[PDB]
Structures are given as structure tokens and as C-alpha cells.
Design a protein around this ligand. Sequence first.
Ligand code: DTY
Ligand code: DTY
Ligand code: MN
Ligand code: MN
Lengths: 346, 350
Amino acid sequence: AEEDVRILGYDPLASPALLQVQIPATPTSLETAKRGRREAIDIITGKDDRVLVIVGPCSIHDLEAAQEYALRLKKLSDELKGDLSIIMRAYLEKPRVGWKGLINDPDVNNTFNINKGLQSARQLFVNLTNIGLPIGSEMLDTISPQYLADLVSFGAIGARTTESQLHRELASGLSFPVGFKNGTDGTLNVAVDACQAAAHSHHFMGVTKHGVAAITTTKGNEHCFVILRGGKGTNYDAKSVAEAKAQLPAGSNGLMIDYSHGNSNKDFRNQPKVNDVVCEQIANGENAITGVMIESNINEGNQGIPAEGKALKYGVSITDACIGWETTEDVLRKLAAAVRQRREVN
Amino acid sequence: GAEEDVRILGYDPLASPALLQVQIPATPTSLETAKRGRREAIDIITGKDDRVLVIVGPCSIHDLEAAQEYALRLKKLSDELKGDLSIIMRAYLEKPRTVGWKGLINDPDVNNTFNINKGLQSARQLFVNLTNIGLPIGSEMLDTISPQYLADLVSFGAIGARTTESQLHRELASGLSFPVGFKNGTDGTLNVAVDACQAAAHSHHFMGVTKHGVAAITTTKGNEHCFVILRGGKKGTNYDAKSVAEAKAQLPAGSNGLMIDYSHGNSNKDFRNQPKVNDVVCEQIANGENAITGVMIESNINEGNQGIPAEGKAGLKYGVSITDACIGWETTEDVLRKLAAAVRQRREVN
Ligand SMILES: N[C@@H](Cc1ccc(O)cc1)C(=O)O
Ligand SMILES: N[C@@H](Cc1ccc(O)cc1)C(=O)O
Ligand SMILES: [Mn+2]
Ligand SMILES: [Mn+2]
């Protein structure tokens, strides 16, 4: 009998329940999460005319820098809350080459420690939600969300998994809105199909809170939407948006636009130009644009990890390039103005 | 309180991999055959062997008895063509949906109900039944849990077009005990499949399950037996001399040989195109194309496909797919004899 010839070992994993006791959610974390969800729901279904904003770092390698970022984001959020509902990006990895993410390599020293990773991720998420800021993250697989789901207001399925049956089944049992990205080829038919699929009940192999594989029956998720993110070209302009709307069946949730990634084509400086174009549409009465996504840090750009380890410029991304804090301020103020102007066209 | 499991109707218990592997024991012939298909696929894709690897059989197995019959014929044809073709039966369990049968694992009674436990039983009993006659099998690797129930029996695993980009499926592949084919993207380009073969070569840590059914961090070695499967897509069919040359142009140093799926995007919404694909491919091969080391074919006892009727399972035509349309046995046997001949020609040219 020949099995496990390419398995080096099975390493012990703390169960979700074990981590949920060890790093407990505060009342404020839990309330913050549920509020982010309600607000998101009202925006994507058209009941609120504010725009949903998912903004923050490409990924979080540094919990302390992330806390200092979050505080600025939260104060900005208090001021702009008439117009914008703000959820911080609390993403753990970048689509894989270079740094393997906070779950895999939380000490940013190219080793593995998935257990300490899940602890860091959970501690992060609690730290952020506890100051009253809702968070969003990528839904990576069927296991890790069980460690974190109590804290999350928004879940994303990346371009690379929108087609994946398992991620569509998973999205169908999650306790929050899920955005599906358009395919890496730059078409959205895959994200429309994901939304439809995810709206139905499925059965997938999940894990229970005690860390055992079990058959998991889902209810279906009515709060999935499509996220425009470019690809093979950019797709944030009015013609692209018109074609996107032409593909959504009646009763669709609103569209979200990502300013980064394929939309900014290899230059983070392009994010504010994406905002200008998206604001012009929203100002002019485009009610189908209900969300945006922005890769923002304290300081702009990105950096490689140098011979010296985790010790690295503070508040600078080690995955995708971000716009810096002051650009983010300008960018978000200008969006809120668009929002108010759309109100008056309406 | 916490707001979790709003959209979870429940959690049902699963027999563990090890429980199932005791309850449906593999025979010494099942285990030898699985090791043998592996060795042979390995030799072909890495160029130690000039036969062609053929993954051939139904789109999906909904009927164990009809597959068993299919298999008896395929094994007799294979005994006869073994100088030229290494044959592995498609023993696939699902098809990519948005209506339709949910597969053998989800819905083993083919009646729009769900019994996952009975389903993994049917799958594993099916793989034992097939491999027990000395026929090796391949299947799609769907997630990180199901393979743990069946991996002892598998010679070939496939990652479909819709998951080739998925990090989790690349990671899985890096720890599987057998060769893995990654299909090119639904857009008809293969960069995503080359990237996946590269990634799967490496060591990864993924969240899998032990043999006793508990989630564990599963550390892998890397899988040096991954290859690319050409299956068409939105750019067009890719089984022609030109497409293969553009394929070859993108393979990195160290890459294993190419497989050509005659079906799916390459049949272009018509199963009767698979013999035509074969001729075009058989022609390249016979004139000296050594970069084509594999083919994939959707084949059943009888041709075509069918919906599931109101009457249910009892209303089904025997030996006819309920998922993608397949060529019939007669036409498969022809396709495979011309294929075997192309391989013979190729030997002469070299
Ligand atoms: N047992 C599988 C490897 C595997 C698959 C899935 C899993 O969760 C763990 C381990 C093999 O020999 O190929
Ligand atoms: N607990 C998740 C649902 C879930 C995710 C993953 C899983 O394996 C089981 C169940 C939620 O509230 O969204
Ligand atoms: Mn990013
Ligand atoms: Mn098929």
C-alpha cells in the first residue's frame, strides 16, 4: 500500500474552539463585526446610498503598524460616516515567489508556524475590531475561516479562486457578505456564476469547532457580489461598468470596484486616478457602484525583505504597493463628496 | 453573543479515512495496480518511455455496474495495446456545475438527495472494484479531504481548469503520491497551468486531515511529476501543431511532457469531434512529435449523454453519461487503435 510518499508529516493544529477561548472576542469586537455586516448588507442591496469601502494594507505583516493605521482609519471613518461605510482590509497573504503570509510565516523569517500564524491572525482581528473598526479578509480555504469568522464583516474570494467549486460552496455558508473577483483574464462571467452558485445550499467538507472534518450543509448566501479588478484590460471606466451591469441578472447586488491590482496596472500611483474616474460616475448618478477597494498603508510603496530579518521600513508593505496615508485621506474625502453629489442627482 | 453559523444548517459526521480503508479494504491486486499505473505514467511523462499515456473513460461514474462493464472491455483492449499505450481509466466522481447531478459523493443514489458517507463508500468501492481487475484509475482531486479516502488506489490525479489557479489545489498536488495534470485555463491559455506545475514542485504546508479525521497541518515534499493538459477554451482549440509549438515555447527547463484532452474545450460542444482531434494529434505523433506524451478521452459504453428524468434513476439509458457527452465504445476502440499505430510510427522516425 503506497500513501504519503510526499507528506513529510502531519503537524498538530489547535482547534478553532481552542483558539476562540484562548484569544476571546470582546463585546466591542463582536458588535463591531455584526454592524459592519448590517451596513454592508444595506449598501449592496441598495437600501443605503453610502458607498462601502474596503481599505487598508495589501497584507498585514506587522500587528503594531496595523494598529496605528487602524486608529487613523477609524478617526477618518467617524468624520466620513455620513457618506462612506468603512471596513479595513485585514488580509493575511497576497496571491503567491516571496513572503508567504501571516498564517504560514508570522515571524517574517521564511519559516513555517501555522499555529502561531492562526493566533497572530486572530489576535490581529480582535485587536482591530476591538477599537470599533470592522474588518475584511480573503476566504482562503474551508478551515481557516472557522478560526476567524466571528470577527469578520466582509469576505473576499480572489480572482484565482472565483471559479473554484469549493470556494463557491464555502461562500454559501459564511455569516457575511462575500465579494467575488472577476477572473484573472478580466472577464466577469465567472464572478456572476459564483454569485449565483453561492446563493444556493451546498454540502462541503468543513471542520467543526473541535477540529474534526464533517459534512457541512449550508443555507445559501444572498449577499454575494462582484468585484471589478482588471486583468487581461482595466475595467473601472463607464463603458466597462456598463458592460458589467449588462451581465448581472435582475435582483443582483451592487458592484464593487478595486482600485488596485489589475485596475492600477503595476503602479500603485494609479489608484487615485481610478478614484477620479469612479467618483465622476458616482457623482453623475451611477447607483450600481456601491463599493470600492483600496490598498492603503501608513507609507507608500512596497519593499523586499532584506538579509537582516523582520528588522524593514515601518508602515511599508512587503507584498503589493499601497498608496500612503495622506493620499488615502484625499482619495476618501473626494469619494465622500461624490457620494453626496450622487444624492442630489438622485 | 457571537454571530457565527447563520448559514450553516448543520454539521454531519463523517467516517474517517482509516475507518473507510478498513471497511472497504483494497485487495493486493488493487494496491499493485495503483503502484504500476503510477510507475508507468511517470516513465512516459518524463521521457523514459515512448508509449503514450491515455486517461480514458466516462465524464463521471454514476453507475458502478456500468463502469465495471466498461472497465472489463478497457482492460482487455489495454492488454492488447500495452506495447504502445499505457491506459488509465477515468474514474471521475463529479462534473463542474449549476443545475445537474451533484456527483457520486454528494448524491450516490442519483435522486437529488444528499448522503456524503454513502457517497465516499460508493467512490472507494468503485475504485477498488476497478483496480482489482488490474486496471489503473485517475480522478479529479477536488479538495484536501476526499483524496485522503481514496489515494491508495489512484494512479493519476487531475486538477480541472476551474481550479488550476487555486493555491490550495496547487498545495495539495505537491503532496499527492502520484502524477498530477493541471488543465489550462478556461480562457484557453496555459500560463496558469505552467505556474501550477512550478508551484506544486515545491514544499507547502496545507490544512488537510489525518487518517483519523482531524484537521492537521500537512507538510509536503513537492511533486516533480506534474504536467500540463491542453483542453481548449475561449482562445480556441489547442490540439494542433501550431498550438503545441506555442505550448512547447512556454515550458520551463525541467518540464514533463504534454497531454491533450480531446474533449471539453477541444471538442467544442460536440463529442463527435473527439475522433477528429485524435487524427490531428495522431498525425503530429507519427511524424515525430515527442512532446505529446499523453491524451485524455471522454468515453462510455454507449455515446452521447442524457438528462435525469422525473422517473428518476430507473429511467436512465444504460451506459450513457449524465454529465458531458462521450464517444461510444466502438469509436473509442477505433480511436485507440489508430493512436497505438501513431506511437508505432513515432518509434520508427526516432
Ligand atoms: N494520502 C495522500 C496525501 C494526502 C491527501 C490529502 C490530505 O489531506 C492529506 C494527505 C497521498 O498519499 O497522496
Ligand atoms: N463559521 C463560519 C462558517 C464555516 C466556515 C468554515 C467551515 O468549515 C465551517 C463553517 C461562519 O460563521 O461564517
Ligand atoms: Mn494586494
Ligand atoms: Mn467531462
